[PDB]
Every structure is written in C-alpha cells, then in structure tokens.
Amino acid sequence: MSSTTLHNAMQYTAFDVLSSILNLMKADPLYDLLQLNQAYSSQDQEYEKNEFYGDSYLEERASSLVLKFLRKYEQIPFEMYSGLRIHTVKNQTLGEIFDLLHLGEKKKKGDLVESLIGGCVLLSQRENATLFLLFAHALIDYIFYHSSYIYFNANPPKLVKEEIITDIQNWFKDKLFYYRSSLEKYQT
Amino acid sequence: SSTTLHNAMQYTAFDVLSSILNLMKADPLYDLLQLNQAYSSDQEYEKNEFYGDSYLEERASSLVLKFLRKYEQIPFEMYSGLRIHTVKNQTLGEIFDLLHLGDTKTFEKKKKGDLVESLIGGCVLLSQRENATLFLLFAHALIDYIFYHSSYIYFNANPPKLVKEEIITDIQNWFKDKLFYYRSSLEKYQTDP
Lengths: 188, 193
Prior knowledge:
The structure is a homodimer.
Chain A: H1 2-25, H2 43-70, H3 79-89, H4 91-100, H5 106-126, H6 130-154, H7 161-187
Helix pairs in contact in A: 1-6, 1-7, 2-3, 2-5, 3-6, 4-5, 5-6, 6-7
GO molecular function (chain A): metal ion binding; ribonuclease III activity
Keywords (chain A): Metal-binding
PDB class: rna binding protein
C-alpha cells in the first residue's frame, strides 16, 4: 500500500527531473550528437559508436547496482543477480522508459536509449557537457529503479521482498533529490 | 621495429603484472577473492565474475573507441569485431596461460576466462569497498594487457585500409607508456604504502 503509492509518486518526480534536465540539454549547441566529429565520422557511424559504448556503460552500472542491493541478503540466490541484470538491460525495459519519458519499435527504442546514454557520457568526456553526464546517470538510475520494482514484484525473494523494495525506493528518492538540486544549482 | 617491440612487450608485461600480483598476495585482502571457488560448487566467485565481465566489457569498449575513432578509414564493423575478439573466452584463456595464472591443462578454456573475469571483478570491488588501490592498479593493468594482446593479433589478421602500421604503433606506444606507469606506481607503493 505504501510502496505502491510511493511508486506512483516516484514516476511523476522522475519524469519531471529527467524532463527538466533534458530540456536544458536541448538548448545546448552540442545537443545534436550525431553531427559531431564530422572530419572523422558520420551520422550513422556516430549513432552506432554511441550505442556501442552506451550498451556497455549501462551494463556495468546495472551490474554494480544489482550487487549493491542484493548482496545485503544472503537468502537471495545468484540466479536473481543474473535475472535482474538481464531484466534491466533488455529492450522491453528500455522501451518502457522511452515511453515514460516521451522521448518519441521495441528494438529501435532500446537502441535509441543506449545511443543516448553513450552519446551523453562520451560528450561529457570530450567537451564541456557535465549536464549530459548528469542526465545519463539519472536515466540509468531510473532504468534500474523501474526494472527492479517490476522484477521483484514478479519474482519476490524469500522473506525480504519488502525490505529490498524499500531499500531501492529510499535510494532512488535520494538520487532524485540529488539530481534535482544539481539541476537547480546548475541553473544558477 | 614493431616486431622487436612486441616480444619485448610480452616480457615486460609478464614481469610488471607478476610483480603487482606478488605484492597483492602479501595483502590479507587477497584471501577475500576466494579464487579457490573456481574449483567448487561458488557464490562470491560468481558475483565477482558477474561484475568483472561487465567491467571488462565497458573498459574494452572505451579503449576500442579511444584508438579507432582517430581513423576515419576504420569502419564500425571493426569496432564490434575488435571488442568481441578482446573479451571472448579464447583471448582471456591466452592471457591466463601467458601469465601462468593456473594449470594450463586442468583448467578448461571457459574456466580460464571465468577466472580472469572473477579476478578483475574482485579486484575492482576490493578497491571500492576497502580502498585497496593496489588491486585497482592490477585490474587496470590486466585489462590494458588483454587489449594490447587482442588488438595486436586482431589488426595483423584484419588490416585496415592504409593505417595498419599507424594504429599498431599507436597501441604499442600507448601500452609501453602504461607499463612504465604501472611499474613506477608499483615501486612507489613498495617504498611508502
């Protein structure tokens, strides 16, 4: 009752934080990631290279978050670690996030999300674009929150389902606070 | 020449990586890697392998982009080809054998790759959970060597248009500089940890 009401609230707040960050990014002249590095690359090759990187970056961050929350509970078998990671990075999950954020086919949606994540991280390493890195971190955190909440409702662990949902919900609420305040401080 | 650089590089890589690992093994935190579980029915070893696999994939992707994107001659098929070549079990087994990490014949090709991934994962996690920075140094040096070794083979088997010798020189010079960085870091660590 409490966790389901909280879950509904978190979707509104995540939408507003990520939408606000993304709306600032769209003002930056660096926003069209696909038309950068024109002497060395092309639009289609930049798209594929950003997706190539974003896929692996998402996988590594998802793995670290799976370990962060599950290792606290020895009654959780290792098959749930692989299960949750698979669930977090599959195109269906990415496409659900694509739709919740109104960024726009399930295969295409997942590729676009990965290319966006990769493009944002890379841009922040090659240019002055720390806002893009903030967006990529917040997007991945929402992907993990969204995936975890669904996965543990479908596959509850013995005894601790409610403890681990509360762990992830409290963590995500704190991340949204930190992304909100970073955004505000950025606006000033 | 590039070929006299390559054999020397495999000598120096072995020595630096063995010397870092020898120091890690003197640290009580090494016990926590539980590499004995490679032989057993398993959980912490598999959790480290779970993470190390993803950490290797991300760092290898970063290195692929780092070197290939300077070369417009190199098309995207070689990015995914080089990455697959770098992280596949065959390559990690070759690294297992080159560093003499365990018995070459009793371990299977797949077990060798799992051990390399579990070693990478446990080392990174130990540095995150206990500030064991020597373990993080080793993880980076091992991934750098996996990438050097893979990339050298890959581009000699699949030469890109025009820039074959340039990209191999690029990667060899980079790895020689990394080995110097790892060696000097190790010496600094020994004197005043």
